[PDB]
Design goal:
31% helix, Arc Repressor Mutant, subunit A, BirA Bifunctional Protein, domain 2, ATP binding (chain A), repressor (chain A), alpha+beta, elongated, aa-tRNA-synth_II/BPL/LPL (chain A), HTH_11 (chain A), 8 helices, biotin--[biotin carboxyl-carrier protein] ligase activity (chain A), seven-stranded mixed beta sheet, homodimer, four-stranded antiparallel beta sheet, 2 domains
């Protein structure tokens, strides 16, 4: 099998359609000017109409777009996946790499050093919202519905969600969601959302519920479905998820216990409003709360 | 870096026993250096079961996260891009043993038409049912590619029965479907196409005033072709009959059919449920399952 990287890297540089003298290319590719002529010859051999002028050098009449594996794969998958079975934190790996991350990029692991090996599935995904930080209102919810639905689609049909960042099964924590957001006025919002699912044995595990899933299968699908769910949330907001949310709310129409800071509130949850805030009914008045943690009572 | 402890778990995935020397042989280290690594395995919570005489083992093997295993389920097949190649179809055909349905190969210059002038794409597919389940496969490829071109601005793209995409009564792309079959066993097909992107008889997308980035065009094809084949895999030609008529370039037109050394004349009337050409001659409509058609 012949190797064609060297002539391909030549034409890729020339894709400007501009002129490049012999030395200029000989610098980048690190070869002699005859080697440049040899490969630019093979370009003419391939049918590439490269015209050579003495002083200026070689050029292509019209700039060309070339086949790129990375360009192609980005459009098929909407993001890459880096799997490190042992890691410190799936969320941290992405946070340390925001500069070259694109929406849909994911990181998968089964042991977080920062709970035994393979007992949990750890998944994080980056997403960039063109709209400012305000466009990520119910993201943490959105991750919850998508992950929970995926577990339902895989046999764990009785998994529910706890407002705002937890997956519950048998009124017990099956998975925790942790979304981390950095924002700046004008600039876009960069969010790395992550979760950890209890696979094997307060807390509950997938196997305890009689649901068996191959970890690669659970991982792949979540990344697939979460990517799709986030594109929906990017162009439509929380609106499509309001009907989907209530169907999985574990504490809706039940007494809940809210702890915001050093304060404690009592009442019946009534789901969420269009802004993802908890609806707490107290003596018939249902008014929304935006932060804290809920608890059955 | 954690490769050595992780590569250790893969070795133990037999469920068998491995002595200190055996692990020190494979990884090329001392068994004391190895012993440090079974510690880190036990440190992570890995239940490494050690019996004195026999050695180290995992009672039940563990399944580890693998990019290749994971990515198969998101994409349903891989993509190898070789901008210069002999034949995208041949690349897949030379690898049927290690191909899975949806695997694709992309190129823009086939050495076995100048560089970058054409997009060359091939995809492998295995149908559990024998060759009989591949009735209209070439049609299905034609429908999917033509629809994608419409979805990307080339809204006047049509199909010529059974293996060509046509635009302004000229060949814009050729389809080449290759099938090997055996009774009982599945059918292995490498279906491929080449689309004229830039510059009578032949036409290019640029000649038709349609601009489409080749990387974008390629990617959309693999998705829709993968999706189209699963549909064809579990439902057959039936859903594509309406889609075919919507794209047939020669329906209700006078055509000339050349199968082998014979020449037939008549009016095309589309296809039947089996993807065969319906040729009307003097009001007599007789079906043909092979050959090539041309205008007249």
């Amino acid at each position: 099998m012949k190797d064609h990287t060297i002539p391909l890297t030549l034409i890729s540089i020339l894709a400007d359609g501009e002129f490049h003298s012999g030395e200029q290319l000989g610098e980048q590719l690190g070869m002699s000017r005859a080697a440049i002529n040899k490969h630019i010859q093979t370009l003419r051999d391939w049918g590439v109409d490269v015209f050579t002028v003495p002083g200026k050098g070689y050029s292509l009449p019209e700039p060309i777009h070339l086949l790129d594996e990375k360009k192609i794969s980005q459009e098929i998958d909407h993001g890459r996946v880096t799997v490190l079975p042992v890691i410190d934190s799936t969320n941290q790996y992405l946070l340390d790499r925001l500069d070259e991350l694109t929406s849909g990029d994911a990181c998968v692991a089964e042991y977080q050093q920062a709970s035994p090996f393979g007992a949990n599935l750890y998944l994080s995904m980056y997403w960039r919202l063109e709209q400012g930080p305000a466009a990520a209102i119910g993201l943490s919810l959105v991750i919850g519905i998508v992950i929970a639905e995926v577990l339902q689609q895989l046999g764990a049909e009785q998994v529910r969600v706890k407002w705002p960042n937890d997956i519950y099964l048998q009124d017990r924590k099956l998975s925790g969601i942790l979304v981390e957001l950095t924002g700046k006025t004008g600039d876009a919002a960069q969010i790395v959302s992550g979760a950890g699912i209890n696979l094997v044995m307060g807390w509950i595990s997938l196997q305890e519920a009689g649901v068996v899933i191959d970890r690669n299968l659970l991982a792949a699908r979540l990344i697939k479905e979460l990517r799709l769910g986030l594109e929906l949330f990017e162009q439509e907001g929380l609106a499509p998820y309001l009907p989907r949310w209530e169907k999985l709310d574990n504490f809706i129409h039940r007494p809940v216990k809210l702890i915001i800071g050093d304060k404690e509130i009592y009442g019946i949850s009534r789901g969420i409003d269009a802004q993802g805030a908890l609806l707490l009914e107290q003596d018939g008045v249902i008014k929304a709360w935006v932060g804290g943690e809920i608890s059955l009572r």
